[PDB]
Copies of this chain bind each other. A is one copy, B any other.
Amino acid sequence: SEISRQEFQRRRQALVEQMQPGSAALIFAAPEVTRSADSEYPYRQNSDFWYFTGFNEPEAVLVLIKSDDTHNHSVLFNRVRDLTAEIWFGRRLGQDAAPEKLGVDRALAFSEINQQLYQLLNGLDVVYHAQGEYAYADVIVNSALEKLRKGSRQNLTAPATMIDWRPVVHEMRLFKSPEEIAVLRRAGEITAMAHTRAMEKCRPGMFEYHLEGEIHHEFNRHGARYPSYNTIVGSGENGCILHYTENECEMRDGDLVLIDAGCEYKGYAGDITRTFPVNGKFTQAQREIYDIVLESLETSLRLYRPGTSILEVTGEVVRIMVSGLVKLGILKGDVDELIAQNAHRPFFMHGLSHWLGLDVHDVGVYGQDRSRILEPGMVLTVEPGLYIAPDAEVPEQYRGIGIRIEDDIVITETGNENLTASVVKKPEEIEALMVAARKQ
Q: Are B217 and A40 in contact (CB under 8 A)?
A: no
List B contacts of A160 (CB < 8 A): 163-164, 166-167
Write the A227-251 contact mask toward B (1 if CB under 8 angstroms, else 0): 0111000000000111111110000
Nearest chain B CB to A194's CB is how many angstroms away? Answer: 12
Nearest chain B CB to A65's CB is how many angstroms away? Answer: 19
Q: Which of A30, A39, A146, A155 has the most CB of B within 10 A?
A: A39
CA A365 – CA B132 in complex, angstroms?
Answer: 30
Known A160-B163, A242-B87, A244-B90: A36·B359 in contact at CB below 8 Å? yes
CA A41 – CA B264 in complex, angstroms?
Answer: 14
List 11 A-B pairs, Cβ < 8 Å.
A33-B34, A33-B35, A35-B44, A37-B47, A37-B363, A90-B246, A131-B162, A155-B368, A160-B167, A213-B220, A225-B247
A399 within 8 A of B: no
CA A241 – CA B368 in complex, angstroms?
Answer: 52
Q: Are A87 and B216 in contact (CB under 8 A)?
A: no
Give me 19 other A-B pairs in contact (C-beta within 8 A), A30-B36, A39-B361, A213-B220 excluded: A33-B35, A37-B47, A41-B41, A87-B241, A87-B387, A89-B241, A89-B243, A90-B244, A91-B241, A132-B145, A155-B368, A158-B164, A210-B221, A213-B217, A213-B221, A216-B216, A216-B217, A216-B220, A217-B217
List B contacts of A162 (CB < 8 A): 131, 161-163
Tell me the nearest residue of chain B to A219, going by C-beta. Answer: B213
Tell me the nearest residue of chain B to A126, going by C-beta. Answer: B161
List B contacts of A91 (CB < 8 A): 241, 246
List B contacts of A35 (CB < 8 A): 33, 41, 44
List B contacts of A368 (CB < 8 A): 155
Tell me the nearest residue of chain B to A370, going by C-beta. Answer: B153
Known A160-B167, A210-B220: A241·B39 in contact at CB below 8 Å? no
CA A52 – CA B123 in complex, angstroms?
Answer: 29
Tell me the nearest residue of chain B to A161, going by C-beta. Answer: B163
CA A379 – CA B47 in complex, angstroms?
Answer: 41
Nearest chain B CB to A94's CB is how many angstroms away? Answer: 15
Tell me the nearest residue of chain B to A363, going by C-beta. Answer: B37
Q: Are B209 and A242 in contact (CB under 8 A)?
A: no
Tell me the nearest residue of chain B to A40, going by C-beta. Answer: B230
A46 within 8 A of B: yes
Among all A-B residue pairs, the 10 with the closest Cβ atoms: A213-B220, A217-B217, A160-B164, A37-B359, A162-B162, A88-B242, A39-B229, A41-B41, A213-B217, A161-B163
A349 within 8 A of B: yes
CA A391 – CA B249 in complex, angstroms?
Answer: 52
Nearest chain B CB to A13's CB is how many angstroms away? Answer: 21
Q: Are A243 and B37 in contact (CB under 8 A)?
A: no
Write the A133-151 contact mask toward B (1 if CB under 8 angstroms, else 0): 0000000001001100100
Q: Are B47 and A41 in contact (CB under 8 A)?
A: no
Question: Which residues 243-266 of A have a CB within 8 angstroms of B?
Answer: 243-247
CA A44 – CA B358 in complex, angstroms?
Answer: 24
Nearest chain B CB to A267's CB is how many angstroms away? Answer: 10
List B contacts of A359 (CB < 8 A): 36-39
CA A162 – CA B162 in complex, angstroms?
Answer: 5
Nearest chain B CB to A289's CB is how many angstroms away? Answer: 17
Q: Are A152 and B217 in contact (CB under 8 A)?
A: no
Q: Are B243 and A39 in contact (CB under 8 A)?
A: no
A223 within 8 A of B: yes
